[PDB]
Coordinates of C-alpha atoms and ligand atoms in Angstrom, one line a residue:
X1 CA 0.1 0.1 0.0
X2 CA 2.8 2.5 -1.1
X3 CA 0.4 5.6 -1.9
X4 CA 0.5 7.1 -5.5
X5 CA 2.1 10.0 -4.5
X6 CA 5.1 8.1 -2.8
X7 CA 5.3 5.9 -5.8
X8 CA 6.0 8.9 -8.0
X9 CA 8.4 10.3 -5.4
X10 CA 10.4 7.1 -5.4
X11 CA 10.2 6.8 -9.3
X12 CA 11.0 10.1 -10.5
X13 CA 12.4 12.5 -7.8
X14 CA 16.1 13.2 -7.1
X15 CA 16.1 16.4 -5.7
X16 CA 19.7 15.9 -3.8
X17 CA 21.8 16.1 -7.2
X18 CA 21.7 19.4 -9.5
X19 CA 22.2 17.0 -12.7
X20 CA 23.5 13.5 -13.8
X21 CA 25.6 12.9 -10.7
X22 CA 27.8 10.7 -13.2
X23 CA 28.1 8.0 -16.0
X24 CA 27.2 5.6 -13.1
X25 CA 23.9 7.6 -11.6
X26 CA 21.5 5.3 -13.8
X27 CA 22.9 1.9 -13.2
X28 CA 23.1 3.1 -9.4
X29 CA 19.4 4.9 -9.1
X30 CA 17.5 2.2 -11.1
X31 CA 18.7 -0.4 -8.7
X32 CA 18.2 1.8 -5.6
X33 CA 14.8 2.9 -6.4
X34 CA 13.4 -0.7 -7.0
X35 CA 13.0 -0.5 -10.9
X36 CA 14.9 -3.3 -11.6
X37 CA 13.4 -5.6 -9.4
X38 CA 10.9 -7.6 -11.3
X39 CA 12.4 -6.8 -14.8
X40 CA 14.7 -4.1 -16.2
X41 CA 12.6 -0.9 -16.6
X42 CA 13.5 0.1 -19.9
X43 CA 13.3 4.1 -19.7
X44 CA 12.7 6.3 -16.7
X45 CA 13.0 10.0 -15.8
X46 CA 14.5 11.7 -12.6
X47 CA 13.7 15.2 -12.0
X48 CA 16.7 17.5 -9.8
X49 CA 14.2 19.9 -8.7
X50 CA 12.6 20.4 -5.0
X51 CA 9.6 18.5 -4.3
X52 CA 7.7 21.9 -3.8
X53 CA 8.5 22.9 -7.3
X54 CA 7.5 19.6 -9.3
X55 CA 4.2 19.6 -7.0
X56 CA 3.5 23.1 -8.3
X57 CA 3.5 22.1 -11.9
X58 CA 0.1 20.4 -11.3
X59 CA -1.4 24.1 -11.2
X60 CA 0.5 25.3 -14.2
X61 CA 0.0 24.5 -18.1
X62 CA -3.0 21.9 -18.5
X63 CA -2.3 19.8 -21.5
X64 CA -3.5 16.5 -23.0
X65 CA -1.9 13.2 -21.3
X66 CA -0.7 10.7 -24.2
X67 CA -3.4 8.2 -22.8
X68 CA -6.1 11.1 -23.9
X69 CA -7.0 11.8 -20.3
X70 CA -7.1 15.4 -19.3
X71 CA -5.1 15.7 -16.2
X72 CA -1.7 16.5 -17.3
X73 CA 0.5 19.6 -16.8
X74 CA 3.4 21.1 -18.0
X75 CA 5.7 23.0 -16.3
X76 CA 6.2 26.7 -17.4
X77 CA 10.1 26.7 -16.7
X78 CA 12.8 24.2 -17.9
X79 CA 13.8 21.6 -15.2
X80 CA 17.0 19.5 -14.6
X81 CA 16.5 16.1 -15.4
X82 CA 18.3 12.8 -16.2
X83 CA 17.1 10.0 -18.7
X84 CA 17.7 6.5 -18.1
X85 CA 17.9 4.2 -21.1
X86 CA 18.3 0.3 -21.0
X87 CA 21.4 -0.4 -23.3
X88 CA 21.0 -3.0 -25.9
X89 CA 23.1 -5.7 -24.0
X90 CA 21.8 -4.9 -20.6
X91 CA 20.5 -8.6 -19.3
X92 CA 18.3 -8.9 -16.3
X93 CA 19.1 -9.1 -13.4
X94 CA 22.3 -7.1 -14.4
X95 CA 20.2 -4.1 -15.8
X96 CA 22.6 -1.5 -17.6
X97 CA 21.4 2.1 -18.5
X98 CA 22.9 5.2 -20.4
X99 CA 22.9 8.3 -18.3
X100 CA 21.8 11.6 -20.0
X101 CA 21.4 15.0 -18.7
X102 CA 19.0 17.5 -20.1
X103 CA 16.9 20.8 -19.2
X104 CA 13.5 20.4 -20.4
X105 CA 9.8 21.3 -19.7
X106 CA 8.3 18.3 -17.9
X107 CA 4.6 16.6 -18.2
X108 CA 3.1 15.0 -15.2
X109 CA -0.4 13.6 -14.1
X110 CA -1.7 14.8 -11.2
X111 CA -4.8 13.3 -9.0
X112 CA -6.2 13.5 -5.6
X113 CA -6.7 16.1 -2.6
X114 CA -4.2 17.0 -2.1
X115 CA -3.8 17.5 -6.0
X116 CA -0.2 16.2 -6.5
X117 CA 2.0 14.4 -9.2
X118 CA 1.2 10.6 -9.8
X119 CA 2.7 9.8 -13.3
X120 CA 5.7 11.3 -15.4
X121 CA 4.3 11.6 -18.9
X122 CA 6.6 13.3 -20.9
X123 CA 9.8 15.9 -21.3
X124 CA 9.6 18.3 -24.1
Ligands
RH201 RH1 1.9 5.7 -14.7
RH202 RH1 1.9 3.8 -13.6

């Protein structure tokens, strides 16, 4: 019974580094955040902004979600993010990733009271 809010924080928040710590980052973080337990999760994004600044996106630019729901929101400012991408030679349980740093607008899906991020949809 992890809450949806807490699952988003575990899968997508890393405020403790300004940018993709190092070439090792995604290998470490995909494992430590438990995204390689049942299979290698093929792609995942981490956001290097404060929790308050990511939560605030739920009152910013309303945009269509990829799944056609209406509860997605685009950040008005660019954010520091790390994209993690499974290498073609990565074989479970030894999940290997390329670490790439970018500064992009994020899109998140928000639900509940309080209204908070529960899903990372895209960066643009
Ligand atoms: Rh999701
Ligand atoms: Rh999900």
